[PDB]
Every structure is written in structure tokens, then in C-alpha cells.
Amino acid sequence: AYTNSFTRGVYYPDKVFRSSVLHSTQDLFLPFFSNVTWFHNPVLPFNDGVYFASTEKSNIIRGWIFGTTLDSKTQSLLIVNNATNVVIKVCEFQFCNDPFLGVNCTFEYVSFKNLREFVFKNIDGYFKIYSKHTPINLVRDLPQGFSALEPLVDLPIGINITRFQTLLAYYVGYLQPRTFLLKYNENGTITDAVDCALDPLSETKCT
Amino acid sequence: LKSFTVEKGIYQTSNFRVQPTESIVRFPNITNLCPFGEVFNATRFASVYAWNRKRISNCVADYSVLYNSASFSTFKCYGVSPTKLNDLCFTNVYADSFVIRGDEVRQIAPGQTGKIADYNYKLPDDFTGCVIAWNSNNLDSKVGGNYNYLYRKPFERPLQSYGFQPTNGVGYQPYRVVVLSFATVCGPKKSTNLVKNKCVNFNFNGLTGTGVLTESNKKFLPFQQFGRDIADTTDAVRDPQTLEILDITPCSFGGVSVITPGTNTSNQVAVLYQDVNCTEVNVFQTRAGCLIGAEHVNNSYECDIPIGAGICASYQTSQSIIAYTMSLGAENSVAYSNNSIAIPTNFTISVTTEILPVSMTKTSVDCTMYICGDSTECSNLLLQYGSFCTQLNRALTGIAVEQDKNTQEVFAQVKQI
Amino acid sequence: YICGDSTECSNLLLQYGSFCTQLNRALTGIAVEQDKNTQEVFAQVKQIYKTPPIKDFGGFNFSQILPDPSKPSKRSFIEDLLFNKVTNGLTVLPPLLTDEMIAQYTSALLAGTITSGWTFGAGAALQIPFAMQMAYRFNGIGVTQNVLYENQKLIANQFNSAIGKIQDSLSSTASALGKLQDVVNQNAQALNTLVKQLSSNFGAISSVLNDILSRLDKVEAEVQIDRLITGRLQSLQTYVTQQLIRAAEIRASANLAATKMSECVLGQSKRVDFCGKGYHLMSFPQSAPHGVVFLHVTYVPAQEKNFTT
Amino acid sequence: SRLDKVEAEVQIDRLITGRLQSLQTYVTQQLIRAAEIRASANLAATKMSECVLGQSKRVDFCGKGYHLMSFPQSAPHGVVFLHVTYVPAQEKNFTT
Amino acid sequence: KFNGLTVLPPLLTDEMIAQYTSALLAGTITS
Amino acid sequence: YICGDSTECSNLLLQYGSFCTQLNRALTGIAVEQDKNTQEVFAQVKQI
């Protein structure tokens, strides 16, 4: 369904240290209190950028598939975690039209109780994936909170993407260009954020 | 000052700036090298009729050091210097393997034709690459004749078996000839050793700067690699290999202050450096900087020439320029009590002189010919801005009016003479 | 600021000429002017004075505004509190006169007025009993001098309690210094501005001189560098003009302050309500960072009665 | 002399821009100086009226000491005031 | 040295200023 | 004034930056000054 998004959707846009200062910048973001798509998984458009979150306690998600055709017909991104290793692929696989699990060749890479959040975007053929884990005690509603997302993996895939799906409750939503004001704590972590277009009061805050 | 002689005072001419001692380059731990043993270091290079054209990408191709060695049978560069891409990330690569007889390999080349091109190793006319070859006739040569060599679509590797053999002629002697076709091939870069506590130019990863490098006490997060001072200045860094947090001190600099009395009196001079210590460039220390060419004195007088923080200097007697703390003036106590009063007995008259400016010199500018210089073409091109000229004149003219007004209202307070 | 130690950039900067001289000459003019203002404000006495150790001043407890012997410097207690209540290429030049000597100047003026009244301002100082001094002020505002003698105790109690009121007013909050604070912040704002535009492009391909030097043809790079040159030059001009305007503001205000101090400290001016509400009686000055503070002591009638005339 | 119109235009544009910017700088800076001179002129007029005609009691406005009278004198682009003042002298202690 | 720039003479010459100064000093000293 | 509601001009102007902002601030100050001066003349009495 549709639920209030609260203040989630915060991530580090740079690998540079700042402390005890306010910084305002414009980037792709998740609007505050927005209506995220909630589900208790058909193909959905990628559009500009994707945000996903899931109440994880049982390894519901088996992975993700990205691409244009959303099939092994062309080079499609595939994510799998098995045994004790994470596998990512961008090959045009010999797989079926739609691999499912119950309750040309190119580069490859080898590496509820909780809430796990992720953000996916592509810039100039380099695909950034950001993630964050936290403990929770809720399964269907959204517990109001505040936490950030750090980068883990970027690779120069160089592949256009339009369609995607997740291989398996969860929430999926979209990022658009908005401006934020962020506060860095003394230790250097992000702890407070302000959205420009929420109300005129926030516009005053930013100005 | 555009004068042979100068009145007494202080002036500014240029700015002192320290110079960095040396340059430093730093880059991360190089790894993920290319499998160079695929073609030119493998067990046996692919024969011409079954030449391999598999692409190679996402690797560190550091073969330029090996390309600099003529030990190979041939190292023909087809447009790229050996060091042209030794520290650059190439778009892609193709590990071609088309070993063929030395004389027969002439037709098996990009843009070539003959019994070896169409049959075995057809290639694009202007395919990027460089020819590399090794002495395959020693052991890689087929004793019973190189039937799989070149004999009679680009990159599709009329048709016959070749007679190349190790015991054959020089021309028929085969070599491991292959046209290595050119962000995938990560050419490794160089780096230098780290130096601290010295004014140095530094290059950390892609960023470059200059200053003093010190072991900082900051606590950068694992994903953090740079530090921004609020004036958007990269001031704190992390070494890519020797993992530590370092900070950068700006290159020391200051103003060149010259203190001198009138040249007509003497030629002795003194020099002040602003906001630097002694070590940087008779020497004395003040809160305003480092002084040379003066003598400090424990005496005190009224101020002659300001320098700063109450420190002033003057030229006096056996004469030199001396620096001292300015005294606020003579002091005298006052004998107050609840039953005493001091009364004057005499008086005098003093005449004092005061001076006040009244007005300037009325100045006007006819900017038309000042800009154009009587040239018609410039006058024509002037029209595209227009009002500027007009506006300027009006402003200037306005000032002139107030000039006269001031003078008038200064002296016209009388109505009859 | 314009070149950043690039040889070709300085070579191109040579093509304009007199910008450097006029820029730094105007800034030096400002630099001379400010300390000239300070000198004009606080030089009006030619000799220094020290109070006698006795405190027989009819209970006039000036304890807050006199220098502190034990504590560092010669600042006064109110002057001490004012410090608590107020917190590359670019270079800050040190002030000409130190805080300690400004404090000494204030102490000398205060001692002179307490011990003498206007005589020292006239010339050679003459001591006079303090009560006699208070008498002539009331003579100056038309009231017969017998009132002071008949109600000295009440006058003293009110003066001390008013000192207490001043302490309370400065103790509640620091908004009273809002002018000085504002002034300080002003310059900082401009400073930060001058830095930000350093990352602009002004229509250039990038904001880094070396990159544009490297990744293009030399002539095209020169065309690109012209943009940065023009942008930074006119931005510097804007900063200089703003400095000029604010300098005019501060210098006019400073001369106003000097006139106020001359006409309200040394003598008893008859200008109505020029130095605070009510008939003026006297004034005491106090130093502060970049600023001056006046305590005016004044006379006010309180209650009235009808009469026929 | 050396160039054609299309070729000359860019150089002429740059020359025009530089010269008119210089004129702008000259105009504004001169105007600032004019402002200072105006303020000084108002001070001078106040001095003249308050001092030469009358006997203002404003202390130290007309120079050190009690102000008796003054005489003005012209000068190239300026005015000079002579102030006549009364000053005490040798003094004695007394008990009162 | 003299192309473009011009200087205008002041409205009142030194002679009138001398007249005014004389008048003011005479008026003071007499009245 | 620069763009006349043209988005492309809006993007092209961004490369100069703070010039667009601080100028307005300057004028704003003058406005307040105006009002203060009016009060400076007429706030010198207590009661009507």
C-alpha cells in the first residue's frame, strides 16, 4: 500500500570529511513523508533511481535482476548470495525467461527482527549501491526513525537499465532531484537533515 | 614609488613566499595484474588457421616493461609508444594469438592481403594494436609441418596447410607473431616516498596540492578519504597505502614591509616580515612579525612611525634605526582630599591654527573620443551599449555642482560688505 | 588569488597592469584610516593620571568602573564583562594600539574627571572636593545648590542602586551590544563570500586552472582562462567597493562618537537630550572591542503638584 | 590599419570593455572622494557659523581651552581658522 | 596629457574669496 | 531580470553563483534603513 516515509532516505553523497558544519546540496533524494509503495514482485520501471527496504528476519530476498529487457536476452545484472559468498553478474545468461525460487558473457564479481535498506543508482555507467542495517521490532508498519546509508559497491557496468525486479513485506520507492541541508556531528557522521520544499518554514531554514 | 628619493615612512613592495623543496606522488597498492601468460608466455601460441581473438578487459596490463625489452622476436609499435599507455587505463584489449611462419605472416596482418589473411587471420583494415612476436621456431614449431599455420571476415579466426617447420628455412621458420589489439587495461602508475615536516608539493591519488604534511589526529571514517575546510579547501588526507590520517599546512607567506627614514638624511634601511617566525627567511621578534635591520631599546618615547602592537621605530643616535614600546605620555598624580582646592593665579592667551578642506578640482571627461580616438568604426560599434556613455557624463557633471555650492555656503553668510 | 603560483597565469595577468596598485592602495588607505579614527577618539588627553588610594567620595561607590589592581590588565569590571559577552592570501593586520593601553586611557580619563571636573580639559589639572564638583552641575541646570547638600545621602543611594540596575541590564542578556556584534559579523560574511566564488566557472570548462591547461589546446585554454581572470577580477572589485562604503559608514560614526565624548565627558553641555533622556549631569566612558560605551548620569523630576499662578 | 572589420571586431570589443571598466572605476572612486569632501564641507560651515560669529560653549570644538573668538583666512581650496583661547597659569593650594 | 580629460575653472576666483574674508573679519572686528 | 523565466538561461547563470543572491540582500538592507530613519525622526516622544 502507501505509507508515510518519515525521515528515511539519507546517504553519504561524497567520501570527504566534514564536521560541525551545515552543508546544503542538491541531489537525487527521497521526499519526506512520501508515499512509498508497500507490499506484504512484478517488473517495475527503474526511472532515475531506486530505493528499497525490507523487514528482514528470514532471508526473504534471493537477489535482484536489472537490465533493459529484464531477461537473459541481453547483458542483465544479477545478484545472488549463496553459502558464504556473494555473486554479481552482468552476463547474458543461458538462464530461463524468469528464474524463480519458492518459499554475451561479460564481467562477474565474487565476494521482523531487522530492517535492511538499500539504494541503487547509475551515473556515467558506474552503478552505486548503498546499504544500511538496523534492528527493529515491527513487521508491517514503518517505525519512525533516522539513520543514514553508506556506499559499499560501485562498478563501471556501462549498461543501460530500464526494467528490474527483485528475486524472492517490503517497500520500494523513487528518488528525484531535491535539495537537502545536512549536519555533520563532531565525530563526522550525518545526524540531521532538512528538506527544502516540505513547507515555507523549511525554505527559511535552508535560506 | 617612481622617485629617486623618498620621504620618511614605510612601504609595501612585494610578498615573500617560501618555495617547496620537492615533489611527492602517492598511489594505492597496485594489484589485479593482467594474466600476461595467456599468449606470449603460454605453453603454445594459437596457430594462424585457428588464431584466437578473445578480448581481454578488467586487468592491469603492465607489459610495457616487457615491451621495453627487445628480447622478443618483434616489438613493432603501430602508433603507440611503449610508455604512451604504461600508466593509463585503456578502453579494452584483445589477446590475439595468430602464430605463423615468419615469411607467411606478412599477409596475416590488419589491412594486409594474401594467402594468410583470408585463410587464417583476417583482421580489420585499421584495427588498433601492436605486433609482438617471439622465437617460436625453437620449440613451438611443428616438426611434422605446421599444417595449422597460415596457408591458402575480419577477426573470424582460400585455405591450405602450411609447410612451416623448425628445420625449414629462415623465412619458413615460425614465430609467435600476434597483433595485440588495444577503462579495462589498468596501466600502473608510479609513486615516491613520503616526506613530512617540510614545505613540499604533494600528489595523493588524483588530487594535488602543496604545503606541510603532518601526522594529524583526526578520525576519518572508513569510507572517508578527504577532508574539507569550510572554505572548500582540501586540508586533510589519508595515505592510500600507509593508512594514516595526515593534515596539510598552507605554504608560509607574508608581506615585505620596508621601513626607512628620508633618503635625504641617510640610507640605512630596515625590513619587516609579517606573520612569520625568525627561521623562515640583527633579528628581533614582535607580535606583528620578524624585524631585521634595527636595534631594540628599553627606552620609550612618543610614536614616530607606527609598526604594530605598540611597537614603533625611529632613526636616532653612532646613529641607527631603533625599535621600542611607545609610551602613552607624561604622568602626574593629583593630590585629592576633601578639604583642599587648587586655584589659578594668572592667565595667558594662546592662538591655535586649524585647517579644513573645502572642495576638489572640477574635472570632466568627454569619453566619446577617449574611447573611439576619432575612428568611425569604433563610433559605430559604440551604439550597442549606448546609455553607459550618457550615464557616466551625468554623474560627473553632478559632482561639479555641489563643489560650487559648498564654497558658496561657506562664505556667503554675509549679506552686505 | 588570481594566479595561484601558475607561471602562464601571471604572464597573462601582466596584460592589464594597474589593477594591483589601485586595489592594494585603496586597502592601505582603509588601513591607515581606521587607526587614525582610534587615535582621534582616544588621544584627547595629553597626560596620564592615577587615583589616590582613598575612597572618601561620600559613598559614591565607583568600585566597578575603576581598574582592578590584582587581576591582569587595567580593565574595569564592566569592561571585563564586555569581553565575555562578545566572542590563504587574505591577511589580517594587527591593530595599532593594544587593549591594555586603551584601558589605561580610559582609566586616565575617569581619574581626571573624578578628581577634577572640567579643569584638566581646560589645561593643567586642578583638584577639587567631589561634593563641590557635584554642586556646580546643579548650578548648571538652574536648581539652587542647597538641594545637593540637603539630600546627599538619598542621591548617593540612588546612584549606587542605579549602578546595580546597570549590572542587571547587562546581566540579563547581551542584546544591548547588538550593534558591535552586527558590525563584526558583517565583515566575516563578506570574507566568506570572497572565497565561495573561487569554485565558480564563469563560463569556463572547469574551476581548476591546471586541468584546463592540461586537457585542451593551448589557445583554447587561454580563451578559457580569460573567463576566470575576468570573473575573479570583478568579484574583487565588488568586495573593494563594499569595503569602501562600510568604511565611510564607520568613519562618520567614529567622528560622531569623538564629538560626543568631547562634549559630554569633559564638560557639561546644555544641548537638550543629546546624551540621553533628561537634563545631563555627567558621563563616564568605558572601552570595548572596536567600540566605546557611555554611562550618562542624569536628573529627572518625578512627582508634581498643582498650583495657581 | 592592419585588419579587416570582422577580424578587427573581437579586438575592438575587448578594448572597449577594458576602457569602459576603467572609467567605471574612476567614476565610482571619485564619487566616494566627493562624499568625504562634502562631509568635511558641512563640518567647515558649522565651524564658521558656530565660532566666528558667536561664542559657542561647546568645549574643545574650537580648539583647546575656553573659546573667545576666531578669525578666518582663505587658502587654495581650503579655509584656515585662528582660535584665540584663555588658559590658566601658576596656581596655589588652599583649604576650603 | 590633454586628450579627453578637461578641467573647469572654479566659479569664484581668489579675488572674490579675498573680498569675502575681508568682509567677515571687518564685520567681526567692528561689531 | 537576467532570464525572463527561461530555464536554459537559469542554468547558464548558475556558473557565476553568489552574485544572484547577495545583491538582493544589499538592497534589502537599504529598505530597512529607510524605515529606521523615519522612526529616528519621530520616536522621540512617549504619549499621544
Ligand SMILES: *[C@@H]1O[C@H](CO)[C@@H](O[C@@H]2O[C@H](CO)[C@@H](O)[C@H](O)[C@H]2NC(C)=O)[C@H](O)[C@H]1NC(C)=O
Ligand atoms: C602673569 O604672567 C605674565 C607673563 O609673564 C607676567 O607678567 C609680567 O609682569 C611683569 C611686571 O609685573 C612685567 O615686567 C612683565 O613684562 C610681564 N611678563 C611678560 C612676558 O610680559 C607675570 O608672570 C604675571 N603677571 C602678574 C601681574 O603677576
Ligand SMILES: *[C@@H]1O[C@H](CO)[C@@H](O)[C@H](O)[C@H]1NC(C)=O
Ligand atoms: C562598595 O562596593 C562593594 C561592592 O559593591 C562593597 O564593598 C560595598 O558595596 C561598598 N564597599 C564598602 C566598604 O562599603
Ligand SMILES: *[C@@H]1O[C@H](CO)[C@@H](O)[C@H](O)[C@H]1NC(C)=O
Ligand atoms: C490638577 O487639577 C486638575 C483638575 O482638578 C486635574 O486634572 C489634575 O489631575 C491635577 N493635577 C495632578 C498632578 O493630578
Ligand SMILES: *[C@@H]1O[C@H](CO)[C@@H](O)[C@H](O)[C@H]1NC(C)=O
Ligand atoms: C599643594 O599640595 C601639597 C599639600 O601641601 C603640597 O605638598 C604641594 O607642594 C602643593 N603644590 C605645589 C605646586 O607646591
